Amino acid sequence: QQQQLPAAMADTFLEHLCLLDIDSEPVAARSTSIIATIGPASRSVERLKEMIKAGMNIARLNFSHGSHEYHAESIANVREAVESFAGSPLSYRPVAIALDTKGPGSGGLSEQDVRDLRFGVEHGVDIVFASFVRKASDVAAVRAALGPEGHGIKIISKIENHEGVKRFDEILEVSDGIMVARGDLGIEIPAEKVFLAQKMMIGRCNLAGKPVVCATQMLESMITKPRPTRAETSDVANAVLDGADCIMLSGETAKGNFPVEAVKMQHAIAREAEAAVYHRQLFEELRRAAPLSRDPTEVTAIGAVEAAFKCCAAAIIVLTTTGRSAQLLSRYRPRAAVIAVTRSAQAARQVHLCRGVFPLLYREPPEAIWADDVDRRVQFGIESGKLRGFLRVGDLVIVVTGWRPGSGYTNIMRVLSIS
Amino acid sequence: RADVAQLTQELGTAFFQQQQLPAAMADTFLEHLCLLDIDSEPVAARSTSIIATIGPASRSVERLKEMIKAGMNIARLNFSHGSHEYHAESIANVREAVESFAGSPLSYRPVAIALDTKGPGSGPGLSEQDVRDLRFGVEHGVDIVFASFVRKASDVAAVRAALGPEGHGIKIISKIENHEGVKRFDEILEVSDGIMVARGDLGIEIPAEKVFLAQKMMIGRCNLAGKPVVCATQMLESMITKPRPTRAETSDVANAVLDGADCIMLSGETAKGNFPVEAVKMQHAIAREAEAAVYHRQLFEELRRAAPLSRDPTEVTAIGAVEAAFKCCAAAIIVLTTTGRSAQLLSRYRPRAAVIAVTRSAQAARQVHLCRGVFPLLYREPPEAIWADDVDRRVQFGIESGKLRGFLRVGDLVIVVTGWRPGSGYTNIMRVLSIS
Amino acid sequence: GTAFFQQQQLPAAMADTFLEHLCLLDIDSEPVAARSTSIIATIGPASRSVERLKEMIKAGMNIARLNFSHGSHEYHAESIANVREAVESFAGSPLSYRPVAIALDTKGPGSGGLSEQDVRDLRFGVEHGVDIVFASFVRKASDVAAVRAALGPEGHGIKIISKIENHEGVKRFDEILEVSDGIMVARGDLGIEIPAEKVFLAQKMMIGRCNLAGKPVVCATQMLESMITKPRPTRAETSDVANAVLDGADCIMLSGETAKGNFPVEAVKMQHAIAREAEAAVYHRQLFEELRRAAPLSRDPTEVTAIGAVEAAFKCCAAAIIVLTTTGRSAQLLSRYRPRAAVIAVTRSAQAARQVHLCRGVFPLLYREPPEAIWADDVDRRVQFGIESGKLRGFLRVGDLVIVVTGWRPGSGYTNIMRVLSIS
Amino acid sequence: ELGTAFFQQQQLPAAMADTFLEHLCLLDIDSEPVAARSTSIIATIGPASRSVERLKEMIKAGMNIARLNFSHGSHEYHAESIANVREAVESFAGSPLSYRPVAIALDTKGPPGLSEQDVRDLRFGVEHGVDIVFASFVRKASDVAAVRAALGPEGHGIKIISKIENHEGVKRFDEILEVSDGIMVARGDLGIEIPAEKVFLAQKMMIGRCNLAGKPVVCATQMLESMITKPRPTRAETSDVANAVLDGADCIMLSGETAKGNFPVEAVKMQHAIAREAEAAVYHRQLFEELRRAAPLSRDPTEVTAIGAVEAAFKCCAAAIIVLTTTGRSAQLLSRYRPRAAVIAVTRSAQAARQVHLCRGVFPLLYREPPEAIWADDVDRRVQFGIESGKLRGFLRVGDLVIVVTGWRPGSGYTNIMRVLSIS
Ligand SMILES: O=C(O)CCCCNS(=O)(=O)c1cc2c(c(O)c1O)C(=O)c1ccccc1C2=O
Ligand SMILES: O=C(O)CCCCNS(=O)(=O)c1cc2c(c(O)c1O)C(=O)c1ccccc1C2=O
Ligand SMILES: O=P(O)(O)OC[C@H]1O[C@](O)(COP(=O)(O)O)[C@@H](O)[C@@H]1O
Ligand SMILES: O=P(O)(O)OC[C@H]1O[C@](O)(COP(=O)(O)O)[C@@H](O)[C@@H]1O
Ligand SMILES: O=P(O)(O)OC[C@H]1O[C@](O)(COP(=O)(O)O)[C@@H](O)[C@@H]1O
Ligand SMILES: O=P(O)(O)OC[C@H]1O[C@](O)(COP(=O)(O)O)[C@@H](O)[C@@H]1O
Ligand SMILES: O=C([O-])C(=O)[O-]
Ligand SMILES: O=C([O-])C(=O)[O-]
Ligand SMILES: O=C([O-])C(=O)[O-]
Ligand SMILES: O=C([O-])C(=O)[O-]
Ligand SMILES: [K+]
Ligand SMILES: [K+]
Ligand SMILES: [K+]
Ligand SMILES: [K+]
Ligand SMILES: [Mg+2]
Ligand SMILES: [Mg+2]
Ligand SMILES: [Mg+2]
Ligand SMILES: [Mg+2]
Q: A269 in contact with D at a CB cutoff of 8 Å?
């Protein structure tokens, strides 16, 4: 069998490793999102179209470099490249825009960060990667600088030093997610300890059900070379096996000679590594650790993921306003793709932070009866799923919906046979 | 602690001290045993059905009303004794006692009628007396047949043929009573609706010290197959003459439930003994304590690991509903069912939540007592013009009956299992509902 | 051979889940190992004859219980003399001699604190060299201290097994177990003191906690009750015996079945037959894993050697673990890990040989030879005595692997060596 | 006792976790490694690392195995490198605290069958007393047989580590491992022969299968590649080293990093620092459980003793397992169960002392005292030599517990004894 299914059926983690097969081809869509830093080498609309086709899901703009005018032009070019595919709604791929802050430097929230965060709100950025977060009050300051109009921007705290690692729990509690910012972390703490901080933070984020990004020097040699080193491919695969929701490219896409090839390489490795995940142990441990809950979205999500594993469901189609119902499905790490049908263009972009969530932006005419409108949003997930290769006639899918309109009312799971 | 901290704050520490919940949260079976607490009171409705043999001591309509209130779910008529006239009178008395509670549809308790055959004796196949008794069963509308001395698949085919075209809906529970039945167990279970571990004959046919191995193996295989299994004979034997059982008898009843038995049975204890109602009350009291002591964490994990992948939407919905019920400590899983099958597939995963099965079939309401944790509710209203409205009314009937009987309280979460179109075989929906 | 792997429920032993283990239990898979759960038989008019006691020893009785709720001191002194005469009638064949413990079961406090009758009975016990006290109605740690004080300076070596018979004993279980040598789940009184339908919860909890503590636990009362008057037990009775062994009980007991009934020998034979079947049905894969996980780290060399020896025995399907012991402690530490291999304990202490019957899977052998001049030769002779005893009794055959547990110097407390030996 | 500080070091809070997810969540950058680094470092000797003075610094930095790549250089060039390694190694014979055996490994050029150059280079290896051959491009069992035949009458004791470098070697892995002493995951060629994104699958599979077989596995190529020109590695490189150790690799390797790079000593220091951190982060609770479950039952006393000793070491947090070995086999069987305790292997064979560096966690001590007339005294002298070396090196202190593994008679193949000692 394909997608490492012989290794998936193993009774121990050791036997699972023994059964990994280089000839077992991945079939599932690539789950781990790729964040590519946009810079001189990846700014043109033509280059950005190739990066989107190669697998870029989130465009990062590093406000440690360039200027407001430079980054606004990169943002406009990203949006032009993304919207060039909107003419085919069944295959359109949303792409998030993330602003990475310069940071506090010596000393709270710097004056440059206040201005850059305001720029982010004015330019409709989806995510903020907040540099050098070392305590909960740093997150509150970033949130306050985003103001009343930036209530919906996701804050991903970058852990870059010893204090951030030690105060991790309080930082994660108030953040939307975390970035393991290994460049500074590898200079702030001994280089030989970074893997411990990475594995601990990824594990704690997986436990919390919040997105975690692995970043910096993942494919470093590809800045000048067309192929990566053996350590670099291993690093990408191990970040996925660790449980990372996203993987990142910095100089590799911002200034390197092979930006598209770096994205293609992360896509190819992530897909292989996702199939090599030992779901039998991972699901059991995530399910045991996820606390008991009376929230119906929480209850429906675990029921849906259990049902998907029982029938080898090709996908879990979920309707979501904010992305939350898709995020609660993603936290259980289903092998089934989570196809999230949303009308919110911002939620479609932001949900790339959660592993295995494939956002579909709904642009079909509304139905007069709310129940019919729900059914056509589900048929839209099915038709997009068929076109993209997620679904085929005869497949089983799990459909997750709610009892009334508006966010917070997901409570239904259905088993549906395709076509 | 972190996996139950928020729910402990919401439901309270008292909730998590009842129904052996501290033992339920243990990380190992050894720790689970260490945490069993005699002060942790059972809260859930008793899920293992009680089969009471009806005879001289339990025949009157007045006595039968007391036995139904004490917990009898299935009335057994042993065709090894009495006659057709005697058993028909017992059946009429059971039906009169059962129907005396029909005036209140929101509290009515269905009771199944089971015919236990005399058996083949020294003959190789279906005896002439069994052919006549099986025909009596069909004519008197019995729900279940406990077929004596089943030794191979062809024995069950002969019982099925003797029930004729009008008895296709009767459940056949094969009684394993000898070495051959144990050795050919897999082929017998494949063609039967369920099994009875008939320990009286089994304990004479094989060494007495080996019966527990056969009992535990057959219960385990039935649990794996998702088919009902009954533990029978001498469970509370001393209660035929004494008001209280022995220490070995209470232990035996508790261990049959912990083994995984769907039903427990009383023979002479209810048929001829001096304390028929007290014997039913004792099995009810022990079964509730034992059900709470089941280590669901390992049982659910092992039932998932051993059960193969399934493309049947009823099976897929059932596992998702049981998983959802455990996540929120659901008070109940309400399921709509025509034949009982959707309730049976929920029961095979052994949820702690009561499975409230709403059905229009009076026979399916009686037969689902064979499946552990299924509480049948007979819906008597005529169909609504719009099918979706009819479905909704049946779910609301389950909620209202649940509140009236004490299964459900305001603020509870319930899991509701329904299908996408009318008719049997289309269950595919699981909903999480808050009781208001 | 392939036949080896079909016996003693070995197909069920290899299962990956407890559910599949149950599914693989086979009534045709015959038990091979020696019966490891000890049988306690209460002595009375049905079992007091010296000749009848010889039959009970041959049937499998390991511990004779004297119930001091019935009979005078004169009655119990005669019981002790009769038991000792029957036991010593087999001493002429040292390779097959079976030690038998004598346990004094107290009348209890009644309406009162240690009663004055219990003080007198406990002093009688010390004067007559009883090995174990089954202390009735233990409700708290101070009840155990009072029993220990009544045994005096000469009774320090007597084991105290606290009987849990009421709600207070169950609630104060942890403090009682801490100061006791072991526990008895005294189901007769327990089933009247608490609701009858709750006794199984108290039994399973106390057995589980004693298994975790590595201390002996006895399941008692009405196990084969109908055999007081009938030749065969009920289906519930055989199930109760099998389930007490599967629960983890070190010992099972007979009261009226051996003291006053018409089938004392048959009741012992029935418990022996059931216990042997149930021991093979134990899912050692999960049990060993959980006993290891729950047991804390230890710096005591006897315990460290014991876990290593039990792990080694499982690795090679060892026929036995032969251990030399002065007090029984090295054998008890092996027993707490529940090896499938029989623990053959060789000792010179007649009292330790009798007391180790409290620990499941310990087969005591009383060595009577005076010490060799060279200590290493004395140890070897005792190990060879264990091997010769085991071959004669059917525990061992040529070609079997055994684990041998000894210490680095004479005297108690110095066990620290485990060795893999081929039987020649 | 041990103290609270003891339980905060070497990732012991993460070690006690009940799940792998909880284990990851408990990894702590402030929990310092205490145990000696157990993953051997292989350094390729070339232009940048040839001088006797540079080799002394590489030995102090942690190099355990010197690799001579016969794809380059010549017989004269590599003989001079080997003589320089031996001079640097023997310069530490004046201090037991710094003297460490260093293996010499010959890596072949590679291949219709065995190339003429490989026949001559393998002959050079035998003539120069090499310990190990890393055989390039092994694709099937007959490739190993050809290398084994070329090692001739004098070199049958040389270990053959088959390098898996292409699709065929991965597909025929089981047959290759069966006849090889171990494996090298040769990622350079493997990453060109198969898609680059699949190398991690082949690495993890081969390491897992070698761990199951109890045979050494090496992770190789581009582990710290950027350190050829830079003083510090990339974040991907440190992660790659840590993950090779967490995967289960017995050895990690440096090629161009030490052969031609500007920072050979720093590359060795970096691998030592990472390996030590990664070894403490291994989740032994699951690893030991799975190695035990997957390993078949065994009647070999060395195998039975090894699992018992590793279980005993975990029970007491033993500072070390001291094993007497002539071939290295008894130490290899301890290593296969991945104890946290260091395996201190005392041997009179200088070749076995160098070769046991292939097995994770084995610390070789070459013993050179003349044999005692009384064999038990010769065994005791070697056990005490292991203890006194352990004390001098920082492995052991007075009051520590150690597990000691020996056999019942002299000669290889008789290991059957495990003892718990207490350091005095
Ligand atoms: O901080 C350190 O020491 C670590 C290295 C950080 C850099 N990583 S990056 O992918 O964000 C990046 C971002 C940028 C550039 C990079 O070359 C680069 O590698 C530019 O040349 C550029 C030039 C004009 C305007 C904007 C940019 C720009 O945004
Ligand atoms: O693509 C390939 O097949 C080649 C990849 C490089 C191989 N790596 S190595 O660490 O074994 C190594 C080995 C050597 C050298 C290396 O520079 C080098 O990186 C030399 O300059 C040298 C020069 C004179 C005599 C001997 C050597 C020598 O032994
Ligand atoms: O994931 P979220 O943000 O809670 O959104 C889920 C919501 O989407 C729905 O499925 C559809 O709601 P809308 O019709 O308002 O889009 C609701 O029933 C449910 O509450
Ligand atoms: O358990 P069964 O026998 O499959 O019955 C379940 C059936 O009951 C329903 O929920 C309701 O069906 P009806 O309206 O025919 O009673 C169906 O949608 C479903 O297929
Ligand atoms: O189990 P215990 O009471 O600690 O006895 C074990 C003792 O028995 C021995 O094996 C033999 O000791 P003796 O020669 O004194 O009988 C000692 O080495 C060891 O300390
Ligand atoms: O690991 P190996 O090569 O089998 O060597 C183990 C041998 O070492 C010993 O412990 C000591 O033997 P020697 O005295 O011959 O060195 C033997 O008892 C044992 O058989
Ligand atoms: O800021 C970052 O991305 C880093 O330091 O790795
Ligand atoms: O038939 C029965 O019920 C039996 O034998 O137990
Ligand atoms: O004392 C006892 O043995 C009892 O009450 O069971
Ligand atoms: O030969 C090697 O070492 C390689 O290819 O990695
Ligand atoms: K930045
Ligand atoms: K009958
Ligand atoms: K008494
Ligand atoms: K080479
Ligand atoms: Mg940074
Ligand atoms: Mg019968
Ligand atoms: Mg009593
Ligand atoms: Mg190569």
A: yes
